[PDB]
mmCIF file of C-alpha atoms in Angstrom:
data_model
loop_
_atom_site.group_PDB
_atom_site.id
_atom_site.type_symbol
_atom_site.label_atom_id
_atom_site.label_comp_id
_atom_site.label_asym_id
_atom_site.label_seq_id
_atom_site.Cartn_x
_atom_site.Cartn_y
_atom_site.Cartn_z
ATOM 1 C CA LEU A 1 108.136 102.083 82.736
ATOM 2 C CA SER A 2 107.402 99.322 85.279
ATOM 3 C CA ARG A 3 103.637 99.460 85.940
ATOM 4 C CA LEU A 4 102.413 100.225 82.433
ATOM 5 C CA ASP A 5 103.354 98.383 79.185
ATOM 6 C CA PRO A 6 105.408 99.904 76.334
ATOM 7 C CA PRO A 7 102.760 101.563 74.063
ATOM 8 C CA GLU A 8 100.433 102.858 76.827
ATOM 9 C CA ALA A 9 103.380 104.387 78.675
ATOM 10 C CA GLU A 10 104.247 106.466 75.592
ATOM 11 C CA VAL A 11 101.365 108.911 75.617
ATOM 12 C CA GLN A 12 102.287 109.243 79.305
ATOM 13 C CA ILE A 13 105.973 109.745 78.481
ATOM 14 C CA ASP A 14 104.966 112.179 75.728
ATOM 15 C CA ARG A 15 102.860 114.243 78.140
ATOM 16 C CA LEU A 16 105.637 114.184 80.745
ATOM 17 C CA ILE A 17 108.207 115.369 78.191
ATOM 18 C CA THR A 18 105.845 118.132 77.050
ATOM 19 C CA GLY A 19 105.285 119.271 80.635
ATOM 20 C CA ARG A 20 108.994 119.200 81.476
ATOM 21 C CA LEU A 21 109.874 121.121 78.292
ATOM 22 C CA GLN A 22 107.195 123.775 78.832
ATOM 23 C CA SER A 23 108.609 124.335 82.331
ATOM 24 C CA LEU A 24 112.131 124.764 80.917
ATOM 25 C CA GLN A 25 111.226 127.063 78.012
ATOM 26 C CA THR A 26 109.735 129.651 80.376
ATOM 27 C CA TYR A 27 112.762 129.271 82.656
ATOM 28 C CA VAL A 28 115.095 130.013 79.737
ATOM 29 C CA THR A 29 112.920 132.987 78.758
ATOM 30 C CA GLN A 30 113.029 134.418 82.289
ATOM 31 C CA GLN A 31 116.788 133.817 82.367
ATOM 32 C CA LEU A 32 117.172 135.729 79.093
ATOM 33 C CA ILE A 33 115.088 138.624 80.435
ATOM 34 C CA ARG A 34 117.124 138.748 83.650
ATOM 35 C CA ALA A 35 120.360 138.533 81.648
ATOM 36 C CA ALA A 36 119.278 141.493 79.512
ATOM 37 C CA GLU A 37 118.449 143.429 82.686
ATOM 38 C CA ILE A 38 121.842 142.532 84.180
ATOM 39 C CA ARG A 39 123.560 143.574 80.944
ATOM 40 C CA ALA A 40 121.830 146.965 80.987
ATOM 41 C CA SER A 41 122.741 147.442 84.658
ATOM 42 C CA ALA A 42 126.361 146.483 83.942
ATOM 43 C CA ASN A 43 126.540 148.900 81.006
ATOM 44 C CA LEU A 44 125.236 151.667 83.273
ATOM 45 C CA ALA A 45 127.747 150.699 85.972
ATOM 46 C CA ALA A 46 130.615 150.720 83.462
ATOM 47 C CA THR A 47 129.550 154.146 82.188
ATOM 48 C CA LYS A 48 129.438 155.436 85.771
ATOM 49 C CA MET A 49 132.862 153.936 86.517
ATOM 50 C CA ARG B 1 80.592 80.960 96.216
ATOM 51 C CA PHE B 2 80.199 84.386 94.595
ATOM 52 C CA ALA B 3 78.024 87.128 96.054
ATOM 53 C CA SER B 4 75.558 89.442 94.344
ATOM 54 C CA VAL B 5 76.777 92.670 92.768
ATOM 55 C CA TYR B 6 75.227 94.348 95.805
ATOM 56 C CA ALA B 7 76.395 93.329 99.258
ATOM 57 C CA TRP B 8 79.359 92.297 97.130
ATOM 58 C CA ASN B 9 81.937 90.061 98.777
ATOM 59 C CA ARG B 10 85.241 91.656 99.745
ATOM 60 C CA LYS B 11 88.419 89.814 100.733
ATOM 61 C CA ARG B 12 91.617 91.445 101.967
ATOM 62 C CA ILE B 13 94.809 89.699 100.695
ATOM 63 C CA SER B 14 98.138 90.238 102.532
ATOM 64 C CA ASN B 15 101.472 88.643 103.551
ATOM 65 C CA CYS B 16 101.779 86.552 100.318
ATOM 66 C CA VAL B 17 103.527 86.049 96.912
ATOM 67 C CA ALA B 18 101.183 86.839 94.037
ATOM 68 C CA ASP B 19 101.753 84.557 91.026
ATOM 69 C CA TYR B 20 99.246 86.381 88.754
ATOM 70 C CA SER B 21 100.145 83.913 85.958
ATOM 71 C CA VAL B 22 97.806 81.423 87.648
ATOM 72 C CA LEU B 23 94.961 83.816 86.770
ATOM 73 C CA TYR B 24 95.432 84.990 83.176
ATOM 74 C CA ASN B 25 96.666 81.527 82.157
ATOM 75 C CA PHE B 26 93.170 80.171 82.879
ATOM 76 C CA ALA B 27 91.120 79.490 79.754
ATOM 77 C CA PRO B 28 87.690 81.022 80.638
ATOM 78 C CA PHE B 29 88.144 84.872 80.159
ATOM 79 C CA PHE B 30 86.495 87.682 78.203
ATOM 80 C CA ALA B 31 88.444 90.531 79.873
ATOM 81 C CA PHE B 32 91.727 90.933 81.753
ATOM 82 C CA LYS B 33 91.305 94.732 81.191
ATOM 83 C CA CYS B 34 93.645 96.571 83.619
ATOM 84 C CA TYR B 35 93.453 100.305 84.582
ATOM 85 C CA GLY B 36 96.646 101.909 85.848
ATOM 86 C CA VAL B 37 98.573 98.637 85.417
ATOM 87 C CA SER B 38 99.284 96.139 82.654
ATOM 88 C CA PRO B 39 98.789 92.343 82.651
ATOM 89 C CA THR B 40 102.440 91.606 81.870
ATOM 90 C CA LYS B 41 103.898 93.721 84.689
ATOM 91 C CA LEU B 42 101.752 92.406 87.614
ATOM 92 C CA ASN B 43 104.374 89.716 88.400
ATOM 93 C CA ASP B 44 107.207 92.319 88.768
ATOM 94 C CA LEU B 45 105.350 94.607 91.267
ATOM 95 C CA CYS B 46 104.742 94.872 95.001
ATOM 96 C CA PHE B 47 101.423 96.317 96.290
ATOM 97 C CA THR B 48 100.770 98.049 99.682
ATOM 98 C CA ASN B 49 97.431 96.261 99.695
#
């Protein structure tokens, strides 16, 4: 936002937002998978208790 | 004096304040095309060479 001018920084900002959102979607997916695993382990632990 | 496109002249510019307005304000031009930087922002920047 300081080297490049408003409308040529946009495709750059668009690509940066896409890259930073694709890196967060997979993180949320892995977090959901690990949370499901932890939930299954906790259900097993509660049954054993 | 301007050299040929081979054996092209090269000048290293350092320890100075760069008022780029003195350049693009000049009437004879066909191109101030700028890759990786924009004409308007040159006066806000600092360059390591």
